[PDB]
Amino acid sequence: KSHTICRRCGKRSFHIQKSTCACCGYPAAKTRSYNWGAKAKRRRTTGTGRMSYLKKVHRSFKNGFRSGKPA
Amino acid sequence: MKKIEDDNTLVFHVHLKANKFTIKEAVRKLYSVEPVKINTLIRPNGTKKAFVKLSADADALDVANRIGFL
Amino acid sequence: PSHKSFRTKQKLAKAARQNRPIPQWIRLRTGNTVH
Amino acid sequence: RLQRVPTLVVAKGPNKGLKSRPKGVKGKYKMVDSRMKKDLRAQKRL
Amino acid sequence: ANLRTQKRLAASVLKCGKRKVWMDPNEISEISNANSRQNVRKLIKDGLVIRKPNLMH
Amino acid sequence: ALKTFELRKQSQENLAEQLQELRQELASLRVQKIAGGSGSKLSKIKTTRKDIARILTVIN
Amino acid sequence: QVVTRDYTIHMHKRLYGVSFKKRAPRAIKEIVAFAQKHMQTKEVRVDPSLNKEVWKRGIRNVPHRLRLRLSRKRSDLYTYVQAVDVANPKMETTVVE
Amino acid sequence: IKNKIVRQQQYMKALHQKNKDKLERRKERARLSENIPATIESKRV
RNA sequence: AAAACUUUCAGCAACGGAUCUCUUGGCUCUCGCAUCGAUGAAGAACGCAGCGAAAUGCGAUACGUAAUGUGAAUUG
RNA sequence: GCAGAUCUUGGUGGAAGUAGCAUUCAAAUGAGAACUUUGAAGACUGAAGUGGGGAAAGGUUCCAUGUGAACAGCAGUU
RNA sequence: GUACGUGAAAUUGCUGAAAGGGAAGCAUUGGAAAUCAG
Ligand SMILES: [Zn+2]
């Protein structure tokens, strides 16, 4: 085996010898991405997972991110 | 069931982070029974199993009846 | 192999249990799918 | 250092509909399907 | 019927091979019933299953 | 089950003893499910879980 | 109907020229064929003892003549073929009581 | 199931499960006086 | 030179999934607004239902808790 | 607005049912036994095993029970 | 009848009718048989 599971992206693209993921570039701080790879971007961009927190923010915006309790 | 009626050992499905010490405390504080040995394994489905051997002063069948899974 | 990380045991178990017949009552509640 | 220092394949039978090096073919090779004969005569007339 | 499991158990109990294991051909019903290792020892002492002796050298 | 307003009308150690009691009851009910239970017990499992959540919510 | 008789079979003339490896299987195929023709019963059962005598000298060597016993045993009418030991297999067919 | 391949697959599993269990009871059972084929004539008003 | 076989035509039955109608989808245009993250994001993994594999939801308070609204369901 | 583009995608033909792909007996089980099971006989590997274990690798593939859809260049009770 | 709306053609089996001496398709003119306007 020349690749193993990547800790960041969870794909079996972590090169053992180079100790680097061919998919997301782990362990570089930034994610690997390319503008020639348009289909690659859409495979892992925002919305392909849960977006649990962004859905909360979008829902909170309308009321002005208010806090407290109703009367 | 064979282990319970033969070796006075109760078999539990325990938490993944539980170690032999915590399983002993949990069994002791949940059933008022003192274990003398705990041997654990990880099942292929990612769940932990604990063999809790009881003292000869206690009967594993009695504890099993009390729990209700007998 | 044998000396396998525990995450692998969870990883292998979930992958296998996905291959599982979909319950009969599941279908009765309108619709449920594969894959 | 100095002293140290194509095969024709017809697209038929098993060789039809290929994409890469076919079976039992090595080195430099060329493919022919008999459709390019019409183009070959045209290029000669050119 | 299928006595493959019995043969494997009989070989394990007798500590011999499956080739040395011999079953009574007319007791297939009781042999098939015996499915645990304790039952295999039950049959063996009854003589229903016999370990074939070694031959010559 | 457990009503949240009467839960909020109690003290923290009383809420702790109720939580301990409910966790025991949940453990017994899940024991009944593995040993073969009735629909009433299996339906009681979910109510007990929500009751634990309400007590934990009030404590927090 | 039900009757038993002792026959002898000229196994040599019946396996003449047969391939060596098939001598024993072809021998059994002829005993059953011999039984079917003589006793006019399609069902034939070969005694395991008679099978042992055919195979005693390997798969290629089959005795030239065999003394066989054929009986029209009632079904559960089939011919049961079993070996018979005689000093010299050259005698007539006899009607066994 | 809005997915046509999946609803077909579940039906075939359902059909096999039904047919297997119908004959599980049928072989267990094996009545004529009570259970008689009802027809349109028998259902005539 | 009858039958079989071959072909033609018609009927019926298959095989196939065209056509027609449809459509909680796509595509295009226009309009309004400006809001991710060390107070841990996007993404990944694993889990959670009485009976669940996907998808959805959620996180050991786990197909949800509180609160407010509605007012009598859920539904295989 | 198609007859064609060694056209695209799907469907279906003739070729063509064509090219082709060391066991024997009795018994048990079964709707069904050239292939399952047991016993007998005959053979094959012959300690360098068709033996018995591990590493790496696979991931449940171990065991028991049931079924005989798809697998099986045949079939099965597999 | 879930191998589920409609269900074309290619193609296949069946029945009916007819043709058939090393191709077939087609065109023209009529005959026969069947069937339409009538
Ligand atoms: Zn990665």
Side-chain angles (χ1 to χ4, degrees):
Chain A
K1 274 184 156 305
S2 50
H3 296 90
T4 179
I5 306 285
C6 172
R7 182 154 74 255
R8 192 151 80 182
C9 75
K11 258 156 52 184
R12 191 170 63 51
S13 308
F14 195 84
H15 200 240
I16 295 106
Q17 264 190 343
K18 287 168 71 175
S19 203
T20 299
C21 180
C23 163
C24 61
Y26 189 67
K30 290 187 151 128
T31 302
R32 203 185 72 103
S33 60
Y34 289 111
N35 299 316
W36 50 259
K39 292 180 68 148
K41 291 170 106 89
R42 78 161 92 121
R43 281 198 263 270
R44 61 92 179 164
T45 176
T46 307
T48 64
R50 310 168 63 133
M51 335 165 51
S52 48
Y53 182 70
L54 283 184
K55 284 153 175 164
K56 289 182 179 182
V57 162
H58 298 329
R59 184 159 81 59
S60 299
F61 171 76
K62 162 179 71 187
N63 281 343
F65 297 104
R66 74 178 170 196
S67 71
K69 318 209 159 163
Chain B
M1 293 297 120
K2 292 176 173 64
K3 294 193 73 66
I4 295 188
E5 73 208 327
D6 187 331
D7 316 289
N8 222 23
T9 75
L10 295 174
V11 189
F12 294 102
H13 175 200
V14 298
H15 195 261
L16 252 179
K17 293 289 105 171
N19 58 63
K20 281 168 198 338
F21 298 117
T22 79
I23 302 162
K24 177 183 248 209
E25 309 158 16
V27 159
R28 200 199 49 75
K29 207 177 75 170
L30 270 181
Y31 313 106
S32 315
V33 65
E34 143 77 356
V36 293
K37 186 163 128 191
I38 293 169
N39 287 5
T40 75
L41 58 84
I42 302 277
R43 303 184 261 180
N45 67 352
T47 62
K48 200 192 281 275
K49 183 206 298 188
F51 309 91
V52 163
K53 184 179 192 300
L54 299 189
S55 277
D57 201 323
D59 155 49
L61 189 291
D62 176 345
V63 200
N65 208 37
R66 199 144 32 58
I67 298 170
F69 79 106
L70 176 37
Chain C
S2 328
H3 304 328
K4 318 189 270 168
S5 180
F6 165 64
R7 298 74 92 180
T8 309
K9 287 216 180 146
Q10 276 181 125
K11 286 287 304 180
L12 292 172
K14 183 192 234 142
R17 64 177 283 277
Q18 286 170 5
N19 296 118
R20 186 260 206 171
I22 313 184
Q24 186 54 186
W25 61 275
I26 262 336
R27 168 64 129 102
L28 296 185
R29 340 185 272 110
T30 309
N32 299 277
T33 86
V34 166
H35 274 182
Chain D
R1 189 279 322 286
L2 198 145
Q3 62 91 28
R4 173 182 170 180
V5 174
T7 74
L8 198 71
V9 182
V10 189
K12 52 179 280 186
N15 278 316
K16 203 179 312 277
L18 263 285
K19 200 261 177 183
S20 182
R21 180 75 59 88
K23 300 288 186 177
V25 171
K26 273 79 185 170
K28 216 183 163 47
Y29 75 104
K30 188 188 282 190
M31 314 274 329
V32 294
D33 52 15
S34 178
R35 192 269 174 199
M36 43 189 330
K37 297 172 76 183
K38 193 166 172 69
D39 194 0
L40 179 59
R41 280 152 65 123
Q43 292 180 358
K44 252 70 175 172
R45 288 158 174 159
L46 286 189
Chain E
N2 204 315
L3 303 195
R4 259 192 274 198
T5 293
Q6 279 83 356
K7 206 146 192 143
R8 178 183 57 78
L9 285 187
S12 173
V13 170
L14 294 153
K15 300 172 183 175
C16 73
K18 319 189 66 198
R19 57 181 283 158
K20 301 286 99 174
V21 167
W22 174 91
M23 323 219 180
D24 174 280
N26 45 300
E27 292 286 16
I28 303 167
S29 68
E30 167 47 349
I31 307 265
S32 67
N33 288 332
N35 62 3
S36 57
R37 296 171 156 286
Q38 201 57 41
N39 296 345
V40 164
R41 309 162 173 125
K42 170 52 181 164
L43 288 198
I44 275 191
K45 216 176 57 151
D46 291 346
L48 271 69
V49 183
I50 309 284
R51 185 198 188 283
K52 283 182 183 174
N54 280 333
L55 72 159
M56 66 67 102
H57 72 98
Chain F
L2 267 300
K3 295 262 46 163
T4 310
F5 43 94
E6 61 164 338
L7 280 175
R8 287 197 267 256
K9 273 157 184 137
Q10 289 156 16
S11 313
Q12 291 291 270
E13 86 304 23
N14 185 343
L15 282 160
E17 73 167 8
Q18 268 189 257
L19 173 80
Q20 200 256 333
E21 261 203 23
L22 268 177
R23 292 197 181 280
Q24 294 187 278
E25 145 194 341
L26 190 62
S28 67
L29 287 162
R30 311 202 137 149
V31 158
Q32 258 50 83
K33 97 179 292 197
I34 81 157
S38 66
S40 90
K41 315 300 188 292
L42 306 176
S43 85
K44 196 166 302 330
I45 285 184
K46 181 174 77 172
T47 285
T48 305
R49 256 193 317 121
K50 306 307 131 185
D51 273 356
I52 282 162
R54 282 179 195 94
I55 274 174
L56 278 186
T57 296
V58 171
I59 291 167
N60 195 263
Chain G
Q1 189 90 249
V2 182
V3 76
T4 313
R5 274 167 271 165
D6 256 2
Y7 304 64
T8 178
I9 191 159
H10 203 145
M11 261 333 278
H12 190 245
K13 78 178 275 289
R14 296 171 185 270
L15 299 187
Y16 188 90
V18 169
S19 287
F20 287 156
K21 296 178 302 300
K22 304 156 198 170
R23 289 294 184 124
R26 189 70 192 89
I28 262 53
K29 274 173 217 43
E30 170 53 307
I31 275 63
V32 55
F34 175 91
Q36 289 200 91
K37 182 178 79 73
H38 264 270
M39 286 279 169
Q40 294 90 23
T41 71
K42 215 223 76 78
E43 301 325 324
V44 170
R45 290 174 185 174
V46 167
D47 192 301
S49 78
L50 158 72
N51 179 70
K52 293 157 43 57
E53 325 316 316
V54 166
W55 289 85
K56 73 208 323 302
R57 311 195 299 177
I59 205 165
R60 299 161 189 153
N61 203 10
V62 173
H64 291 173
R65 312 191 182 197
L66 253 49
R67 187 59 169 185
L68 298 214
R69 191 179 300 274
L70 283 76
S71 65
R72 275 183 188 169
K73 287 205 269 213
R74 197 264 183 279
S75 176
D76 293 330
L77 258 303
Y78 67 92
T79 304
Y80 191 44
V81 193
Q82 69 225 96
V84 170
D85 198 340
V86 295
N88 165 299
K90 288 173 69 71
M91 43 289 308
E92 295 47 20
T93 75
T94 68
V95 174
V96 174
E97 69 275 15
Chain H
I1 311 162
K2 204 68 67 175
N3 195 350
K4 95 172 289 179
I5 286 177
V6 181
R7 71 192 128 171
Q8 177 181 354
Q9 284 152 328
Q10 291 308 283
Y11 167 57
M12 289 157 47
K13 280 197 70 79
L15 187 73
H16 164 245
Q17 174 73 29
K18 149 172 91 183
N19 302 147
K20 198 165 182 178
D21 278 54
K22 295 296 286 293
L23 278 82
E24 278 302 311
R25 311 199 309 297
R26 193 174 184 176
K27 300 296 285 185
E28 164 162 342
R29 169 169 52 97
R31 174 205 103 193
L32 283 174
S33 84
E34 165 55 51
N35 301 320
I36 188 170
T39 72
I40 278 169
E41 290 96 355
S42 73
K43 275 172 287 277
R44 214 83 173 181
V45 50

